[PDB]
Design a protein around this nucleic acid. Sequence first.
RNA 1: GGACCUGGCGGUGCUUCAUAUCCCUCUAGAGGAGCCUGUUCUGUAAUCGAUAAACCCCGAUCAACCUCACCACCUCUUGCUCAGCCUAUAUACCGCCAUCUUCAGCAAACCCUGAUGAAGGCUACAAAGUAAGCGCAAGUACCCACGUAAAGACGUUAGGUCAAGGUGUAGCCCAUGAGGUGGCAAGAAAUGGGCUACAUUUUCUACCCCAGAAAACUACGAUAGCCCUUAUGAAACUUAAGGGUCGAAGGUGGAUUUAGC
Lengths: 343, 132, 129, 205, 211, 247
Amino acid sequence: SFFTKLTADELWKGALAETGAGAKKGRGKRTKKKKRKDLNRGQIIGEGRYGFLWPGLNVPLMKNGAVQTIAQRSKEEQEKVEADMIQQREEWDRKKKMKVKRERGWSGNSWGGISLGPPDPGPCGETYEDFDTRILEVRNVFTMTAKEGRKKSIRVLVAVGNGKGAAGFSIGKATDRMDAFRKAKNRAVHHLHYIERYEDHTIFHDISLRFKRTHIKMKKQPKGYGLRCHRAIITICRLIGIKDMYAKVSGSINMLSLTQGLFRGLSRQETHQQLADKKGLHVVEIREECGPLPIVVASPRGPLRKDPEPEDEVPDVKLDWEDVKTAQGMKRSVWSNLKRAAT
Amino acid sequence: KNRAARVRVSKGDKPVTYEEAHAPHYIAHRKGWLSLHTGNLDGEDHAAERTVEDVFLRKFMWGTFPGCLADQLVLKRRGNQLEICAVVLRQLSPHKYYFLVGYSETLLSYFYKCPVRLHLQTVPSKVVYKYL
Amino acid sequence: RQFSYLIENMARDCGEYAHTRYFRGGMLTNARLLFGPTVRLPDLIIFLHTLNNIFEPHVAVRDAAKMNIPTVGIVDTNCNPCLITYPVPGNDDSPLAVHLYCRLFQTAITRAKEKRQQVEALYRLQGQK
Amino acid sequence: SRYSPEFKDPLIDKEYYRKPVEELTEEEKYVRELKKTQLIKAAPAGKTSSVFEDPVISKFTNMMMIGGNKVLARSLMIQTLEAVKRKQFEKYHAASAEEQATIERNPYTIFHQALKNCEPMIGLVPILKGGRFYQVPVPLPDRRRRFLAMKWMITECRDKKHQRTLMPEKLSHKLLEAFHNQGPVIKRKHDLHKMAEANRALAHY
Amino acid sequence: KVWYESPSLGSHSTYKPSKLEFLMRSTSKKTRKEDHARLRALNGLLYKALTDLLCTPEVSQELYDLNVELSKVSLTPDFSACRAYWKTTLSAEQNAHMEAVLQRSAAHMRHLLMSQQTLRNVPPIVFVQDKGNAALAELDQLLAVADFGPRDTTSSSLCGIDHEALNKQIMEYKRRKDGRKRAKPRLEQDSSLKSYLSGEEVEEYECYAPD
Amino acid sequence: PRQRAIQWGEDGRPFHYLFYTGKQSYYSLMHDVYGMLLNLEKHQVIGSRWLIKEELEEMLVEKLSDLDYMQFIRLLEKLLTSQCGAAEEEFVQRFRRSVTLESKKQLIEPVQYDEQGMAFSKSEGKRKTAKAEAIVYKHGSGRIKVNGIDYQLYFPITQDREQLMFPFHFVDRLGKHDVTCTVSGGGRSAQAGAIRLAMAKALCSFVTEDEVEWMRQAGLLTTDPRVRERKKPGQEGARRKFTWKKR
RNA sequence: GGACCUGGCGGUGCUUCAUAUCCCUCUAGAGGAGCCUGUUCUGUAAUCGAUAAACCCCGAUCAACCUCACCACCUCUUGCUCAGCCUAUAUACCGCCAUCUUCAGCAAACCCUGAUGAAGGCUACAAAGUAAGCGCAAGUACCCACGUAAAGACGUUAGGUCAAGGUGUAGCCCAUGAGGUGGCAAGAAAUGGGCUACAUUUUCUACCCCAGAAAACUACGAUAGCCCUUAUGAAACUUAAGGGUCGAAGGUGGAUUUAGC
Ligand SMILES: [K+]
Ligand SMILES: [K+]
Ligand SMILES: [K+]
Ligand SMILES: [K+]
Ligand SMILES: [K+]
Ligand SMILES: [K+]
Ligand SMILES: [Mg+2]
Ligand SMILES: [Mg+2]
Ligand SMILES: [Mg+2]
Ligand SMILES: [Mg+2]
Ligand SMILES: [Mg+2]
Ligand SMILES: [Mg+2]
Ligand SMILES: [Mg+2]
Ligand SMILES: [Mg+2]
Ligand SMILES: [Mg+2]
Ligand SMILES: [Mg+2]
Ligand SMILES: [Mg+2]
Ligand SMILES: [Mg+2]
Ligand SMILES: [Mg+2]
Ligand SMILES: [Mg+2]
Ligand SMILES: [Mg+2]
Ligand SMILES: [Mg+2]
Ligand SMILES: [Mg+2]
Ligand SMILES: [Mg+2]
Ligand SMILES: [Mg+2]
Ligand SMILES: [Mg+2]
């Protein structure tokens, strides 16, 4: 019956079944999903199976200065049109099938390590093209609710940085994973730390700190050492601009504790100029590749002390057994100093 | 909960027209009727035939002007004249709108045996009353 | 509130701004939403009292630092000056103390505005000739 | 109600209006100037300013009305008042000059005194204690005392024990019985009071 | 602090129990955890104040002789009224004397309570009567006056089943005779990243009389 | 809708010194009122109401809370109790909106004259579906004609006659006026009520003003709005529901 | 396994509440009788769906044929249709709804607190919240500004409906489709709802309220049973109306329970 026919929108809303108890709680999963297709896309007004040529609708109205008359394509001429539409339909299906693959993160199914692009431009014509965003954690949080039972939300941790010392991180929360990405990355750009870098490649000194139960021990390293650190630290260090560092994470390996523990330690590092100003002495760098040449890296801006720094015969500094065990050749690990890809 | 002819609240990104935004209880209060004829007045006949004709004319024009209609049809009957007033978009070339007006008016005049006129009002885009 | 009226008049007289009322959450940290994307925030916030009525730090002290706004503040012996850029230890309760502060700031602000006009005017007259 | 809360109930009393101004107090003067600004409900069809109006009998008539049949309810009432008066005129003419002084012939005086002799001072309430029900005595408000007196009188006359006796003969006979502190309805009062005395121990609840 | 909580952030706030404060309050506002505490303890203070006035002869000689005992004293949260309860006496005759003196004393007592500047704003005290079952004595007042007049079906239900109906039912018949696994929600698998890592590819001038 | 103007210029400086409050118009008003109360100290109903919050929210062109409205009103009342002068009185009247009090006094029908010169009044009354029109003559013997019939023949029910008596009895005018009324619709009781209202309205032309106010306060001049309620679908009656089936 | 958070639950505390409303109070009912009607069960060769509140004179504002989707028998195969399917799945759905709702909350985008933990964000003499939009509200309909309607978001019960229609998925295609003829739908019982009663405030007649009779085995009481006529129809022991005959249970209904301001 002609009167029982419906519109395309009605037919797709029913067939897709996007509203319903199946889609409310994700009670139904979709390895095979009906996909909406626009069936009016490649259709031309006036074109039908019979192949009639209507002047002014599907063919030009005037030809050679005279009005065209009703005509019909030959059976052969119409087969070509039909075949051409099928090929054009498969070409469109293949153009959509040809989608550029995006690089993976720490693993194929992991979100961690994936770039989200620069933060969105602020309302007042503000732009952050110089900043890159990296995901550090994507979690599904399940909230028990008074009336709706277990609901599913997304908590995202992302870090931003420009590669020149300015970096920050923020948590994002939303029901949708892509809204959480927007919240986290946009908020992080307003909570940027500045991290001082020695020679724009490493930290100024060894940093060992604890944040809650996460211990992070970082070592200053020379050029060419690379980033031999927890994969999350590697991600953050590329955003800050540190190229050479060793780091070891102990205790709880909690991503959030690690991120803010890492940023707390890197933001409280004393530069060489601050050391010279604090002690009013020269800072002299001795490099074995340069032999005994003394390289003054920092000199005090104020007066220069005349009294040498007291030489305590034995320092009362606390040592790490892991560092000492390594220097004494008593550290045996099959996993240490393994060959890995450039980081 | 009532469902009939109610566009449901969403995230604020769904544009609805004036007609779509008003549930049935607003008919004759905030929105008028899309067809005007005498068949539903007291003491008048042939309401069934006018109703079937209206259902056909709405489907006919939907498929005759595919993707061009920007709102529901307004059907007016005076005597034996049938006036179809449609708000359409400005995407199709004017030649195609004149062809379909001549084609539709003639075909409908012979189908229902009455003088039929089609009045097209073009808009650059669908007129948005609110974003639900 | 003993000095709300006095402070609001001092601000109007010097050509500046006063907020002596309940401070709503986000006036500074969410100003673009509350006022508009083109809203200009204060370049200097002067606290004549750094505590709210429940004897806690005024929320604007924390929020001023968040927005990188320098703060001047009278800090009594029960106040916290850590986040105040230019703290001024002094009595904030006595009417004589508060009145003095308003005269000094009002006078300092008014003198600087007249100095700015004098210099500009001189710089223009000399420029033409 | 189709009356907005602004509508005040009508006061139907001729005397209240003819009262001179001088007799009025400053409080009563304010109420009178106030009502001139208030909305007044239309007087119900039941009550009028007639000098023969009796609110108690009008209430007893409504408690006897079945299915909105006021005509029949009013007819039964007036037939009862005539039956009481005729029974007393017969008792009056047959009595001696000395006894005649003690015989009441007004049916309104008998009707009111008959009901007042049936009003229960104290009543009982069913209370629940430890999964077990025990009645508790309580004082009765004035509205409840007058209601129970009417309901017991109307209930007794509707009892099936009376066989083929018309209501005006049943009710008239019960009113004159109660008028003399005799009858089943008076016993119901006495028994209600008697049951209260037994349950005095449970009055702490 | 103790198990009794005293961590309130606004612990320095000045408690203001007055009738005007109730009107100038957010309707959304609901009583906080330690907000009842001040009410529970302020009502107890009123009990202390009233009890001393009763036992001291200086306040009133009539009141002192009565030796009234307060059963309960609970102020209202509205700040409009105060509820005070005194224990009734056996003799209804004595009850009338106590209530009469207390009714007239209350007015002066309120002023005496204003002498305590800490509780200067005292709402009018409502000297309710309770603890003596005043109704029970009230009932006896009517009981003596009252006129008493001249003084002189199936055991199946007990069984718990309708044995009769079932017996008929069988007799009528005789007349004719003759689980699944549920996956952990956290482990539910998603394909959003695969669609992301596969790729997301959803992918002017105007003229009169154009050509 | 009225649009708030820009609150700052090109340099970005707000125009009003209370801009950063977010309620500059409201707090500028409180600031002006608080200042006036101070100056007074240094120096020393029926027809009007306070404007509502929705009217204050338009004078200020801002959004206000309910407590914001109260605090402003509490401050104005505190200004009336003081010895406010003329300058302090024009200001308060800006926030006093006159409350129009409707007259409850009954409108009196005109007194007409017939061909024979007898004065009479005419009115109408409605009760339920009954509609009555009554002609009350200034002088008469107490005759009442209902559709040409003697009232006791038209109204054999004594309660319907008591309703006709009520208007005349209440004003002590039994046996002083002749009435000829016509009534249609409704039942016997509804028709008697409509005639009662029609006669009372017409009778008001022949009584003193004080008597007309006494009839009003007795409910004799008010049209009874109590009419039958519609039945609703899904229930037995206008209010009664279908039996809630045993569970 | 420790600590904490949420939800659920508590024969969990306290305070304030419910307005035809949880209890008592007020009025008329149901629960007993007969009948009408639905359901269950049983029965039958002989549909289906609804089926605690939120099913049960419900889809039906309606089944003698038809309707019809059921059973039995017979018949047709490009088939009324560029076929068809009342076949499965309402736990794929659109559409249209129930329910809380006789609710007042939901909520995008931001902001802030908790060390940037799950989480939380109110104080008016105010202490971090601002909030578009939706709902309530307002407005409109009916006889008012009252009342009654209507409206009533998000969400809850994978609630109801594939048999309104449409439709995803799977299935049938000489049959799970189409047509014809006849037939089923009863009551051993149970139960829900309703009707009429048990009478004297009644019964019959006149009248539409000033009447006369009736009034316990010839009273009250069947709208049931049986018989006859009529109406509708092609078809009527069947459906409806009327008449005749018949004159039964019922004597105001335990626990319990419904409605009304
Ligand atoms: K809990
Ligand atoms: K019953
Ligand atoms: K559904
Ligand atoms: K369907
Ligand atoms: K299907
Ligand atoms: K029933
Ligand atoms: Mg893989
Ligand atoms: Mg509904
Ligand atoms: Mg101080
Ligand atoms: Mg009814
Ligand atoms: Mg029954
Ligand atoms: Mg079923
Ligand atoms: Mg089902
Ligand atoms: Mg159910
Ligand atoms: Mg058949
Ligand atoms: Mg059939
Ligand atoms: Mg079939
Ligand atoms: Mg469902
Ligand atoms: Mg209304
Ligand atoms: Mg409704
Ligand atoms: Mg509404
Ligand atoms: Mg289901
Ligand atoms: Mg078949
Ligand atoms: Mg019969
Ligand atoms: Mg026939
Ligand atoms: Mg008989």
